[PDB]
Design a protein around this ligand. Structure first.
Ligand SMILES: [Cu+2]
Length: 127
């Protein structure tokens, strides 16, 4: 009860816009996959986690940081956890410590590829 599977597709969609993390999990695992046909250079996706209020800046700086940095600013302390940027036929998992989430905050997940974040975003709720 401490993982979730998510897909990103060739139509710039995740197949969820919300998941939970139970507060009794010590670690939580996100398993991202790209079952499309377009490569990462034109339709790459990542799962990037931050507070809801930090998502905009993570995205802005990330899009400006280069494909070769997976569209994340180096040493961006607002990023709680993330997967790699993946393309067709690839998958990547991230396991993180739930202690990184505070029960007082609200959290969102998103993709930082150029143009994808307003389409590819969702809520993570710690319950
Ligand atoms: Cu994307």
């Amino acid at each position: 009860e401490c993982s979730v599977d998510i897909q990103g597709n060739d139509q710039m969609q995740f197949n969820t816009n919300a998941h939970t993390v139970d507060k009794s999990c010590k670690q939580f695992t996100v398993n991202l996959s790209h079952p499309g046909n377009l490569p990462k250079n034109v339709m790459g996706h990542n799962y990037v986690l931050s507070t809801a209020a930090d998502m905009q800046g993570v995205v802005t700086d990330g899009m400006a940081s280069g494909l070769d940095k997976d569209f994340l600013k180096p040493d961006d302390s607002r990023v709680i956890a993330h997967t790699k940027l993946i393309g067709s036929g690839e998958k990547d998992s991230v396991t993180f410590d739930v202690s990184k989430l505070k029960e007082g905050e609200q959290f969102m997940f998103f993709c930082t590829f150029p143009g994808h974040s307003a389409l590819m975003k969702g809520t993570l709720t710690l319950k």
